[PDB]
Amino acid sequence: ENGYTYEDYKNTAEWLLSHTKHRPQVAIICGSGLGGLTDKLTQAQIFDYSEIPNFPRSTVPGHAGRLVFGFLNGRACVMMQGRFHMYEGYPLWKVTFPVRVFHLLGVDTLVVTNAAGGLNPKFEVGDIMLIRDHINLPGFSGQNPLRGPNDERFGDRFPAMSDAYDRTMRQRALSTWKQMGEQRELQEGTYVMVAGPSFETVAECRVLQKLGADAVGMSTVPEVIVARHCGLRVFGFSLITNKVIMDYESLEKANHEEVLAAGKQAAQKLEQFVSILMASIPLPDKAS
Ligand SMILES: O=c1[nH]cnc2c1ncn2[C@@H]1O[C@H](CO)[C@@H](O)[C@H]1O
Description:
By secondary structure, this protein is of the alpha/beta class. The chain has one domain (1-288): Rossmann fold, CATH 3.40.50.1580. The protein has eight helices and nine strands. It has helices at residues 6-17, 92-95, 97-105, 137-140, 167-179, 202-210, 221-230, 265-277; strands spanning 26-30, 42-48, 66-72, 75-81, 109-118, 128-136, 187-193, 215-217, 233-243. It has a five-stranded mixed beta barrel with strand order 5-8-7-6-9. Helix 1 (6-17) packs across helix 3 (97-105) and helix 3 packs parallel to helix 7 (221-230). It starts with 5 loop residues before the first helix and ends in an 11-residue tail after the last helix. It binds inosine. The site of inosine has 18 residues, from strand 5, strand 8 and strand 9. One of its GO terms (molecular function) is identical protein binding.
Protein backbone atom coordinates (compact mmCIF):
# COMPACT_ATOMS: atom_id res chain seq x y z
CA GLU A 1 0.00 0.00 0.00
CA ASN A 2 2.80 2.50 1.10
CA GLY A 3 3.22 6.02 -0.28
CA TYR A 4 -0.49 6.63 -0.79
CA THR A 5 -3.19 7.02 1.85
CA TYR A 6 -6.74 5.84 1.23
CA GLU A 7 -7.82 9.39 0.84
CA ASP A 8 -5.11 9.85 -1.80
CA TYR A 9 -7.05 7.43 -3.96
CA LYS A 10 -10.34 9.00 -2.98
CA ASN A 11 -9.18 12.53 -3.85
CA THR A 12 -7.85 11.43 -7.19
CA ALA A 13 -11.05 9.48 -8.09
CA GLU A 14 -13.34 12.26 -6.95
CA TRP A 15 -11.22 14.81 -8.87
CA LEU A 16 -11.54 12.68 -11.89
CA LEU A 17 -15.30 12.30 -11.39
CA SER A 18 -15.84 16.03 -11.12
CA HIS A 19 -13.83 16.41 -14.33
CA THR A 20 -15.43 14.05 -16.80
CA LYS A 21 -19.15 13.39 -17.21
CA HIS A 22 -18.01 9.86 -17.95
CA ARG A 23 -18.49 7.21 -15.27
CA PRO A 24 -16.55 4.20 -16.52
CA GLN A 25 -17.34 0.52 -16.08
CA VAL A 26 -14.39 -0.93 -17.89
CA ALA A 27 -10.74 0.03 -17.46
CA ILE A 28 -8.42 -1.09 -20.23
CA ILE A 29 -4.65 -0.98 -19.84
CA CYS A 30 -2.98 -0.94 -23.26
CA GLY A 31 0.43 -2.58 -23.63
CA SER A 32 3.23 -1.68 -26.04
CA GLY A 33 1.89 -1.34 -29.56
CA LEU A 34 -1.73 -1.79 -28.59
CA GLY A 35 -2.17 1.86 -27.66
CA GLY A 36 -4.36 2.45 -30.74
CA LEU A 37 -7.49 1.09 -29.07
CA THR A 38 -7.82 4.63 -27.77
CA ASP A 39 -8.65 5.61 -31.36
CA LYS A 40 -11.82 3.57 -31.07
CA LEU A 41 -13.33 5.52 -28.17
CA THR A 42 -16.23 7.91 -28.70
CA GLN A 43 -16.85 11.01 -26.71
CA ALA A 44 -13.18 10.56 -25.76
CA GLN A 45 -12.06 12.79 -22.91
CA ILE A 46 -8.25 12.84 -22.65
CA PHE A 47 -6.19 13.58 -19.51
CA ASP A 48 -2.44 13.55 -18.96
CA TYR A 49 -1.38 11.51 -15.94
CA SER A 50 0.19 14.72 -14.75
CA GLU A 51 -3.00 16.80 -14.81
CA ILE A 52 -4.46 14.14 -12.53
CA PRO A 53 -3.78 14.73 -8.81
CA ASN A 54 -1.75 11.87 -7.48
CA PHE A 55 -1.11 10.09 -10.75
CA PRO A 56 2.44 8.92 -11.49
CA ARG A 57 3.75 11.02 -14.41
CA SER A 58 5.58 9.03 -17.12
CA THR A 59 9.46 8.82 -17.08
CA VAL A 60 9.97 9.45 -20.83
CA PRO A 61 6.51 9.58 -22.56
CA GLY A 62 5.68 13.32 -22.57
CA HIS A 63 4.94 11.99 -26.07
CA ALA A 64 1.85 10.01 -24.93
CA GLY A 65 1.47 8.90 -21.33
CA ARG A 66 -2.29 9.53 -20.80
CA LEU A 67 -5.72 8.41 -19.59
CA VAL A 68 -8.65 8.60 -22.08
CA PHE A 69 -12.35 8.11 -21.22
CA GLY A 70 -15.06 7.33 -23.78
CA PHE A 71 -17.42 4.58 -24.94
CA LEU A 72 -16.20 1.56 -26.78
CA ASN A 73 -18.76 -0.73 -28.40
CA GLY A 74 -21.40 0.18 -25.87
CA ARG A 75 -19.13 0.13 -22.84
CA ALA A 76 -18.24 3.03 -20.64
CA CYS A 77 -14.43 2.77 -20.60
CA VAL A 78 -11.26 4.49 -19.48
CA MET A 79 -7.97 3.51 -21.04
CA MET A 80 -4.41 3.89 -20.01
CA GLN A 81 -2.30 4.69 -23.05
CA GLY A 82 1.13 3.77 -21.80
CA ARG A 83 1.36 1.87 -18.53
CA PHE A 84 3.84 2.07 -15.63
CA HIS A 85 6.57 -0.58 -15.31
CA MET A 86 8.89 -1.60 -12.44
CA TYR A 87 12.02 -1.28 -14.61
CA GLU A 88 11.35 2.42 -15.00
CA GLY A 89 11.71 2.82 -11.25
CA TYR A 90 8.10 2.86 -10.16
CA PRO A 91 7.61 1.18 -6.80
CA LEU A 92 4.84 -1.35 -7.38
CA TRP A 93 2.48 0.77 -5.30
CA LYS A 94 2.81 3.49 -7.98
CA VAL A 95 2.55 1.15 -10.96
CA THR A 96 -0.85 0.02 -9.66
CA PHE A 97 -2.18 3.34 -8.32
CA PRO A 98 -4.34 3.57 -11.46
CA VAL A 99 -6.24 0.42 -10.58
CA ARG A 100 -7.17 1.58 -7.07
CA VAL A 101 -8.47 4.79 -8.68
CA PHE A 102 -10.37 2.88 -11.38
CA HIS A 103 -12.18 0.94 -8.66
CA LEU A 104 -13.24 4.13 -6.82
CA LEU A 105 -14.34 5.55 -10.21
CA GLY A 106 -16.79 2.69 -10.43
CA VAL A 107 -14.84 0.35 -12.72
CA ASP A 108 -15.89 -3.24 -12.22
CA THR A 109 -13.81 -4.91 -14.88
CA LEU A 110 -10.20 -4.48 -15.98
CA VAL A 111 -8.92 -5.82 -19.26
CA VAL A 112 -5.09 -5.74 -19.36
CA THR A 113 -2.91 -6.27 -22.40
CA ASN A 114 0.83 -6.48 -22.82
CA ALA A 115 3.50 -7.57 -25.29
CA ALA A 116 5.22 -10.73 -24.19
CA GLY A 117 7.93 -12.96 -25.51
CA GLY A 118 7.14 -16.53 -26.44
CA LEU A 119 8.45 -19.41 -24.39
CA ASN A 120 5.99 -22.05 -25.51
CA PRO A 121 7.25 -23.08 -28.99
CA LYS A 122 3.71 -23.54 -30.29
CA PHE A 123 3.52 -19.74 -30.22
CA GLU A 124 4.06 -17.80 -33.42
CA VAL A 125 5.09 -14.17 -33.23
CA GLY A 126 1.91 -12.25 -33.81
CA ASP A 127 0.01 -14.84 -31.80
CA ILE A 128 -2.34 -13.50 -29.22
CA MET A 129 -2.16 -15.45 -26.00
CA LEU A 130 -5.15 -15.38 -23.67
CA ILE A 131 -3.80 -15.17 -20.14
CA ARG A 132 -5.13 -18.15 -18.11
CA ASP A 133 -2.64 -17.87 -15.18
CA HIS A 134 0.54 -16.02 -14.13
CA ILE A 135 3.84 -16.79 -12.35
CA ASN A 136 4.64 -13.70 -10.28
CA LEU A 137 8.41 -13.99 -9.99
CA PRO A 138 8.93 -10.55 -8.34
CA GLY A 139 6.12 -11.25 -5.87
CA PHE A 140 7.78 -14.47 -4.66
CA SER A 141 10.46 -12.09 -3.29
CA GLY A 142 8.42 -9.26 -1.77
CA GLN A 143 7.83 -7.32 -4.96
CA ASN A 144 4.11 -7.66 -4.52
CA PRO A 145 1.79 -4.58 -4.87
CA LEU A 146 -0.12 -5.53 -1.74
CA ARG A 147 2.95 -5.22 0.56
CA GLY A 148 2.48 -3.10 3.63
CA PRO A 149 -0.58 -2.31 5.75
CA ASN A 150 -3.87 -3.61 4.23
CA ASP A 151 -6.98 -1.55 3.70
CA GLU A 152 -10.08 -3.54 4.34
CA ARG A 153 -11.92 -0.83 2.36
CA PHE A 154 -10.19 -2.19 -0.69
CA GLY A 155 -9.90 -5.83 0.25
CA ASP A 156 -8.52 -8.58 2.45
CA ARG A 157 -5.04 -9.11 3.82
CA PHE A 158 -4.57 -12.41 2.01
CA PRO A 159 -6.44 -12.31 -1.32
CA ALA A 160 -6.37 -15.27 -3.61
CA MET A 161 -5.03 -15.21 -7.06
CA SER A 162 -5.93 -18.87 -7.54
CA ASP A 163 -8.70 -17.48 -9.76
CA ALA A 164 -7.53 -14.08 -11.14
CA TYR A 165 -8.19 -14.38 -14.86
CA ASP A 166 -11.98 -14.58 -15.04
CA ARG A 167 -13.07 -17.97 -16.39
CA THR A 168 -16.25 -16.72 -18.09
CA MET A 169 -14.53 -14.07 -20.17
CA ARG A 170 -12.02 -16.66 -21.30
CA GLN A 171 -14.74 -18.78 -22.86
CA ARG A 172 -16.26 -15.63 -24.38
CA ALA A 173 -12.91 -14.71 -25.86
CA LEU A 174 -12.26 -18.25 -27.11
CA SER A 175 -15.63 -18.09 -28.83
CA THR A 176 -15.72 -14.40 -29.92
CA TRP A 177 -12.49 -15.39 -31.66
CA LYS A 178 -14.38 -18.09 -33.56
CA GLN A 179 -17.42 -15.79 -34.12
CA MET A 180 -14.98 -13.66 -36.08
CA GLY A 181 -13.80 -16.94 -37.65
CA GLU A 182 -10.15 -15.86 -37.68
CA GLN A 183 -8.00 -18.72 -39.05
CA ARG A 184 -5.34 -19.14 -36.33
CA GLU A 185 -6.85 -19.84 -32.90
CA LEU A 186 -6.44 -17.40 -30.03
CA GLN A 187 -3.78 -18.97 -27.89
CA GLU A 188 -3.95 -19.37 -24.08
CA GLY A 189 -1.41 -20.09 -21.36
CA THR A 190 0.66 -18.93 -18.40
CA TYR A 191 2.30 -15.48 -18.22
CA VAL A 192 5.51 -15.06 -16.20
CA MET A 193 6.33 -11.52 -14.99
CA VAL A 194 9.99 -10.69 -14.84
CA ALA A 195 11.36 -7.15 -14.13
CA GLY A 196 14.78 -5.57 -15.04
CA PRO A 197 14.80 -3.90 -18.41
CA SER A 198 17.23 -6.32 -20.09
CA PHE A 199 16.04 -9.29 -22.14
CA GLU A 200 16.52 -12.90 -21.07
CA THR A 201 19.51 -15.09 -21.77
CA VAL A 202 19.13 -18.57 -23.28
CA ALA A 203 19.63 -20.07 -19.85
CA GLU A 204 17.13 -17.79 -18.08
CA CYS A 205 14.82 -18.56 -21.01
CA ARG A 206 15.07 -22.23 -20.20
CA VAL A 207 14.35 -21.73 -16.49
CA LEU A 208 11.15 -19.88 -17.40
CA GLN A 209 10.29 -22.88 -19.68
CA LYS A 210 10.78 -25.28 -16.81
CA LEU A 211 8.74 -23.09 -14.44
CA GLY A 212 5.90 -23.63 -16.87
CA ALA A 213 5.63 -20.21 -18.49
CA ASP A 214 4.31 -19.74 -22.01
CA ALA A 215 4.93 -16.05 -22.31
CA VAL A 216 7.37 -13.71 -20.44
CA GLY A 217 6.81 -10.02 -19.86
CA MET A 218 7.64 -7.15 -17.53
CA SER A 219 4.21 -5.89 -16.43
CA THR A 220 0.52 -6.91 -15.92
CA VAL A 221 0.74 -9.06 -12.78
CA PRO A 222 0.97 -6.05 -10.38
CA GLU A 223 -2.17 -4.57 -12.00
CA VAL A 224 -4.00 -7.92 -12.11
CA ILE A 225 -3.23 -8.50 -8.40
CA VAL A 226 -4.63 -5.24 -7.06
CA ALA A 227 -7.58 -5.52 -9.42
CA ARG A 228 -8.41 -8.80 -7.72
CA HIS A 229 -7.77 -7.33 -4.31
CA CYS A 230 -10.45 -4.80 -5.22
CA GLY A 231 -12.85 -7.31 -6.65
CA LEU A 232 -12.37 -6.41 -10.26
CA ARG A 233 -13.21 -9.04 -12.86
CA VAL A 234 -9.99 -9.54 -14.67
CA PHE A 235 -9.02 -10.81 -18.10
CA GLY A 236 -6.21 -10.01 -20.51
CA PHE A 237 -4.24 -10.97 -23.60
CA SER A 238 -0.58 -10.94 -24.40
CA LEU A 239 0.70 -9.96 -27.86
CA ILE A 240 3.59 -12.41 -28.65
CA THR A 241 6.04 -9.92 -30.19
CA ASN A 242 9.07 -12.24 -30.40
CA LYS A 243 10.26 -15.79 -29.78
CA VAL A 244 12.59 -15.88 -26.82
CA ILE A 245 15.79 -17.67 -27.89
CA MET A 246 15.79 -20.99 -25.99
CA ASP A 247 18.85 -22.40 -27.78
CA TYR A 248 22.44 -21.43 -28.36
CA GLU A 249 22.19 -20.54 -32.09
CA SER A 250 18.98 -19.22 -33.71
CA LEU A 251 19.75 -15.46 -34.02
CA GLU A 252 16.02 -14.96 -34.80
CA LYS A 253 15.92 -12.12 -32.34
CA ALA A 254 13.49 -11.40 -29.55
CA ASN A 255 13.00 -7.63 -29.31
CA HIS A 256 11.30 -4.28 -28.51
CA GLU A 257 13.25 -2.09 -30.85
CA GLU A 258 11.94 -4.93 -33.10
CA VAL A 259 8.39 -4.36 -31.80
CA LEU A 260 7.08 -4.00 -35.39
CA ALA A 261 4.87 -6.95 -34.36
CA ALA A 262 3.21 -4.56 -31.86
CA GLY A 263 3.39 -1.94 -34.58
CA LYS A 264 1.82 -4.33 -37.09
CA GLN A 265 -1.55 -5.68 -38.24
CA ALA A 266 -0.96 -8.09 -35.38
CA ALA A 267 -1.50 -5.28 -32.94
CA GLN A 268 -4.31 -3.81 -35.05
CA LYS A 269 -6.34 -7.01 -34.82
CA LEU A 270 -6.02 -7.34 -31.01
CA GLU A 271 -7.48 -3.86 -30.99
CA GLN A 272 -10.72 -4.95 -32.67
CA PHE A 273 -10.74 -8.25 -30.76
CA VAL A 274 -10.80 -6.21 -27.55
CA SER A 275 -13.45 -3.91 -29.05
CA ILE A 276 -15.70 -6.89 -29.81
CA LEU A 277 -15.35 -8.33 -26.33
CA MET A 278 -16.78 -5.06 -24.94
CA ALA A 279 -20.19 -6.46 -25.91
CA SER A 280 -19.51 -9.52 -23.76
CA ILE A 281 -18.44 -7.69 -20.60
CA PRO A 282 -21.44 -7.99 -18.23
CA LEU A 283 -23.21 -4.76 -17.43
CA PRO A 284 -23.36 -3.67 -13.76
CA ASP A 285 -27.10 -4.26 -14.06
CA LYS A 286 -26.58 -7.99 -14.85
CA ALA A 287 -30.08 -7.75 -16.44
CA SER A 288 -31.55 -11.04 -17.85
O1 LIG B 1 11.47 -11.77 -24.85
C1 LIG B 1 10.92 -10.96 -24.07
N1 LIG B 1 11.22 -10.97 -22.72
C2 LIG B 1 10.69 -10.13 -21.80
N2 LIG B 1 9.80 -9.17 -22.08
C3 LIG B 1 9.49 -9.14 -23.40
C4 LIG B 1 9.98 -9.97 -24.39
N3 LIG B 1 9.45 -9.66 -25.61
C5 LIG B 1 8.61 -8.62 -25.41
N4 LIG B 1 8.65 -8.31 -24.09
C6 LIG B 1 7.81 -7.11 -23.58
O2 LIG B 1 8.05 -6.02 -24.54
C7 LIG B 1 8.26 -4.71 -23.92
C8 LIG B 1 9.38 -4.04 -24.70
O3 LIG B 1 8.93 -3.93 -26.07
C9 LIG B 1 8.57 -4.90 -22.45
O4 LIG B 1 7.82 -3.92 -21.62
C10 LIG B 1 8.13 -6.43 -22.18
O5 LIG B 1 6.95 -6.49 -21.28
